[PDB]
């Protein structure tokens, strides 16, 4: 369990690093967000199963529900961005500096 939890924490750290280090693809950024979500789910689930906290077992499902709402809104915003520009380029999303 502690080695597994350390590996899951490092997986979250890598997914957060990917989110913070942008490339050209907003879809890839959203995928990094979903990877962070997946790492959080696995950490919460193994913690609940290790501590036998059946009362806290609804919490990972709630995490999945709200994170899927987040991903849904992100896809809708990516639809709007692609309708504006033709691509999902964060380099195109830059005209609010002035």
């Amino acid at each position: 369990m502690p080695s597994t939890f350390f590996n899951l924490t490092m997986a979250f750290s890598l997914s957060l690093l990917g989110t913070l280090m942008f490339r050209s693809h907003l879809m890839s950024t959203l995928l990094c967000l979903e990877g962070m979500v997946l790492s959080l789910f696995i950490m919460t689930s193994v913690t609940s199963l290790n501590s036998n906290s059946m009362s806290s077992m609804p919490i990972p499902i709630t995490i999945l529900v709200f994170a899927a709402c987040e991903a849904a809104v992100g896809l809708a915003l990516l639809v709007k961005v692609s309708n504006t520009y033709g691509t999902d380029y964060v380099q195109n999303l830059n005209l609010l500096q002035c």
């Binding site: 939890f5 989110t19 979500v37 919460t44 809104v73 915003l77 961005v81 609010l96």
Partner: protein, 345 residues
């Protein structure tokens, strides 16, 4: 927007911070944050222009990343202590990650780079809703864990927030960007007084809200997004120049306005806790904030910029736009300094 979706979106916008403030569980506080973000995105992108799309996208990814870091802190605390609240012995790394993610959600420097850009490109009422309502729930989360936070990191975040807010407000001419950097500076003050006395954090938050609301309403009177646009206000609404000047001076913290009271009492509490260097640096950067406010006052009220020919037709037309709640908030944000012992607790 049909009234059904207006009611749904506005009720969820209201319900987010309410759930966050009323929730004992960290997970329910987090889902209140999720409610606030998800519900406020469509009203940000409601005008359906490229700038609004960019603002909604930037706000979404910033708040989503910060909420993921919050969720990491919550899950790590649940792993360490088996509970759903940072009680007393949660790890300092967990608490610092919570503080950092909540500061990125709040929009204070050096996590402030999105806030003037998100505030730009959205309509004025949505800028008001953002800069007032969206900061209550993260501040409530920070207030609930005030004895656990790290004073060094909090003071560093606060001082860089006030510095960057002062410099950004000094540079910008767009009114939304000016209000956003004002928000950054005042959030810096609130964070500075957070670990010592959260009652003063709430006091400064309430003073900032009742000062920010009528300034945004006065901007909403004519959709004046620019210094020049607010400068020709003497031809459009000449009766609002005095209240504009008084509210901007109150935002500057000049006595005897009631906006001097939050900075004054925060400085007093910091002096009681022996952080004189931080208090003095914050006060000097507040003077810089007052400088860009004073330049705004010079543009709109004390001088009279040249007007247009169609402003004659605008004076021919009549308006009913300033609501009943504008003057109450303006007076309560202007002339309430003698009630300072009642305003503090």
């Amino acid at each position: 927007m049909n009234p059904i979706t207006l009611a749904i979106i506005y009720f969820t916008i209201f319900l987010g911070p309410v759930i966050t403030m009323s929730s004992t569980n960290l997970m329910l506080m987090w889902v209140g944050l999720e409610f606030s973000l998800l519900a406020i995105i469509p009203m940000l992108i409601n005008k359906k222009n490229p700038r609004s799309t960019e603002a909604a996208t930037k706000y979404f990814v910033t708040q989503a990343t910060a909420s993921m870091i919050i969720l990491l802190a919550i899950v790590l605390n649940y792993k360490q202590l088996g509970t759903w609240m940072f009680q007393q012995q949660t790890n300092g790394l967990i608490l610092n990650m919570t503080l950092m993610a909540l500061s990125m959600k709040l929009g204070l420097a050096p996590f402030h780079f999105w806030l003037p850009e998100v505030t730009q490109g959205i309509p004025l009422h949505m800028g008001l809703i953002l800069l007032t309502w969206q900061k209550i729930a993260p501040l409530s989360i920070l207030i609930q864990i005030y004895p656990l936070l790290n004073s060094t990191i909090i003071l560093m975040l606060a001082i860089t927030s006030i510095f960057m807010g002062a410099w950004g407000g000094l540079n910008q001419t767009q009114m939304r960007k000016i209000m956003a950097y004002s928000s950054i500076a005042h959030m810096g003050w609130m964070l500075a007084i957070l670990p010592y006395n959260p009652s003063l954090t709430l006091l400064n938050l309430m003073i900032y809200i009742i000062l920010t609301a009528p300034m945004f309403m006065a901007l909403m009177l004519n959709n004046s997004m620019t210094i020049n646009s607010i400068s020709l206000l003497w031809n459009k609404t000449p009766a609002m120049l005095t209240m504009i000047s008084l509210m901007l001076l109150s935002l500057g913290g000049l006595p005897p306005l009631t906006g001097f009271l939050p900075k004054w009492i925060i400085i007093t509490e910091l002096m009681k806790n022996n952080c004189l260097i931080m208090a003095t640096l914050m006060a000097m950067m507040a003077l810089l904030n007052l400088f860009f406010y004073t330049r705004l006052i010079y543009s709109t009220s004390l001088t009279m910029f040249p007007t247009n020919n169609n402003s004659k037709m605008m004076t021919h037309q009549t308006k009913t736009k300033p609501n009943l709640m504008f003057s109450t908030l303006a007076i309560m944000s202007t002339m309430t300094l003698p009630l300072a012992p009642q305003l503090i607790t």
